Amino acid sequence: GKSKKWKEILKFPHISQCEDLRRTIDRDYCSLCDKQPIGRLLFRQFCETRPGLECYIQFLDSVAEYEVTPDEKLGEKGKEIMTKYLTPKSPVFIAQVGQDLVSQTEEKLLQKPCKELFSACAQSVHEYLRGEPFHEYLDSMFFDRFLQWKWLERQPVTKNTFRQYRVLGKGGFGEVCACQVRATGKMYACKRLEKKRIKKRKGESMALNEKQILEKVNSQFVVNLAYAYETKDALCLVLTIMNGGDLKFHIYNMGNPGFEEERALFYAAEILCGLEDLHRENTVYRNLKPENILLDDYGHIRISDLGLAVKIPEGDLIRGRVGTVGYMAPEVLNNQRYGLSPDYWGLGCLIYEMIEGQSPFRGRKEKVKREEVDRRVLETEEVYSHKFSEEAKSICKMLLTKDAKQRLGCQEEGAAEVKRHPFFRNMNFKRLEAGMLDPPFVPDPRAVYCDHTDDDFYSKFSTGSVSIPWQNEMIETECFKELNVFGPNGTLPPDLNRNHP
Numbered sequence: 001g002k003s004k005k006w007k008e009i010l011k012f013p014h015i016s017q018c019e020d021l022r023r024t025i026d027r028d029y030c031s032l033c034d035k036q037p038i039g040r041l042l043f044r045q046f047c048e049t050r051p052g053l054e055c056y057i058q059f060l061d062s063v064a065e066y067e068v069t070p071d072e073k074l075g076e077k078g079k080e081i082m083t084k085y086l087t088p089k090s091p092v093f094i095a096q097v098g099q100d101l102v103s104q105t106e107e108k109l110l111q112k113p114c115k116e117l118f119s120a121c122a123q124s125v126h127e128y129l130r131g132e133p134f135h136e137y138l139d140s141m142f143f144d145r146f147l148q149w150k151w152l153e154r155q156p157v158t159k160n161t162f163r164q165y166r167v168l169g170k171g172g173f174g175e176v177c178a179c180q181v182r183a184t185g186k187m188y189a190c191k192r193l194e195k196k197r198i199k200k201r202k203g204e205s206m207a208l209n210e211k212q213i214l215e216k217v218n219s220q221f222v223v224n225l226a227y228a229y230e231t232k233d234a235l236c237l238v239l240t241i242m243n244g245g246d247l248k249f250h251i252y253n254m255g256n257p258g259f260e261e262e263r264a265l266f267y268a269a270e271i272l273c274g275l276e277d278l279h280r281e282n283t284v285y286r287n288l289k290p291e292n293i294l295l296d297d298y299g300h301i302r303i304s305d306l307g308l309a310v311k312i313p314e315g316d317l318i319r320g321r322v323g324t325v326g327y328m329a330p331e332v333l334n335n336q337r338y339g340l341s342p343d344y345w346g347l348g349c350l351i352y353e354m355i356e357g358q359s360p361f362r363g364r365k366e367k368v369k370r371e372e373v374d375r376r377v378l379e380t381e382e383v384y385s386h387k388f389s390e391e392a393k394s395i396c397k398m399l400l401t402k403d404a405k406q407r408l409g410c411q412e413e414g415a416a417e418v419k420r421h422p423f424f425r426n427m428n429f430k431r432l433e434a435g436m437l438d439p440p441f442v443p444d445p446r447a448v449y450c451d452h453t454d455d456d457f458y459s460k461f462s463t464g465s466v467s468i469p470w471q472n473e474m475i476e477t478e479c480f481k482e483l484n485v486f487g488p489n490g491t492l493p494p495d496l497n498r499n500h501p
């Protein structure tokens with residue numbers, strides 16, 4: 001459902017327009033060839049024009065398949081890669097990986113296999129592409145093409161760039177709608193923050209902090225910010241759309257109430273990965289509760305309401321009694337200086353609630369005052385039933401340790417300590433992070449499961465399109481596949497030839 005004249009909207013600019021971009025973009029290999037989706041594709045396309053370089057791209061592709069390969073099949077795939085890319089007489093043999101490392105990689109296969117067998121070589125390969133090959137791509141027409149894509153990326157976003165549909169959810173500062181990008185057809189969830197209520201509450205720094213944390217996070221298990229633009233009477237945040245409902249609805253309206261342990265494991269595993277991605281930016285969530293975990297069309301989850309998120313300065317703690325009653329960690333209730341520990345408390349609350357069908361400190365059929373709930377969170381130890389395996393009791397007990405100093409995942413090791421807990425003993429995370437594990441529930445598509453002083457503030461909020469999400473949108477909608485064309489027989493097209501604009 002793209003616009004009638006979308007090819008004119010996303011029409012490449014002439015290379016002569018991107019000179020100011022050429023001189024300002026940092027020439028970082030990892031950014032221009034890996035992180036940025038369109039740059040990564042263009043560089044790979046460049047290597048596919050040089051017989052010498054192509055064999056290296058295929059090798060890395062096979063290593064990625066090796067990491068997610070099942071354990072019983074690790075040995076099988078490990079040999080295919082060796083006798084194809086690493087034998088000296090191959091049509092796809094890679095020479096920049098030292099013959100010393102080729103003999104070292106072979107011995108490890110004579111021993112038992114591990115998912116990180118080719119990590120030594122893979123890094124040796126990237127080191128080669130970091131140099132000469134990367135610097136030729138920079139003086140190639142594929143980097144010029146990349147500059148054109150960046151030029152489109154930086155274009156101004158307005159109300160006309162989108163097409164609003166329905167009011168999905170509602171909240172405090174405003175509402176949440178469903179926007180579509182006219183040129184691409186991609187659907188989003190336009191959260192509308194009324195300018196009026198922000199100016200009065202004076203939550204300028206509160207709305208900006210949410211936008212800044214969302215644009216800086218790049219995770220498969222957290223809502224991603226795609227556009228941040230300004231309209232009259234309201235600001236907007238274009239985020240990932242989630243049509244599968246929230247976890248609260250699935251625990252109580254679709255549940256026993258509750259899930260099987262194995263089903264809760266999948267959701268807990270994906271939530272743990274989301275929190276790990278937030279903690280990489282030293283950002284704490286503090287709002288972990290079932291209604292904030294949303295499901296998508298495929299059945300995977302994402303963390304949604306980042307309105308209470310804060311970026312902790314490294315080496316510094318924060319103070320703040322915030323959150324929802326019954327989902328506040330003891331250090332939060334007591335209003336102490338805490339770090340990221342409130343999130344591991346919340347994870348324990350969710351695993352328990354998913355498995356048991358009720359909060360660990362308030363029964364589903366129980367009516368108690370907010371003060372009694374809080375006393376339990378600070379003084380009473382939770383109990384477990386026969387729905388919990390011993391491993392499940394363990395992780396829940398550790399994550400619900402009232403002393404944040406002894407709570408799981410609150411050490412210097414971080415989320416890694418929680419991933420090796422026996423509760424995830426059968427969870428291959430590498431495959432989960434690769435989206436290769438089928439969710440336990442797939443929602444049906446047709447289903448429904450529910451003043452010049454204020455100008456400086458809008459300047460730093462209405463930043464525009466976010467780089468990585470925008471490029472991914474270009475790829476999913478196949479706009480990149482269609483427009484990324486060149487001259488017949490590997491020759492310069494008109495838009496990339498400075499001779500005849």
Ligand SMILES: *[C@@](O)(C(=O)Nc1c(C)[nH]c(/C=C2\C(=O)Nc3ccc(C(=O)N[C@H](C)c4ccc(F)cc4)cc32)c1C)c1ccco1
Binds near residue numbers: 168193239305306
């Ligand atoms: C059903 O009506 C339904 O689930 N609608 C719905 C959809 C499709 N998406 C959402 C909500 C979010 C979403 O998809 N992504 C996202 C990210 C962040 C928030 C959030 O933080 N909301 C808070 C509560 C908020 C704060 C301030 C404010 F002004 C408004 C909201 C929410 C979402 C929803 C609700 C349905 C429709 C089709 C099938 O099922």
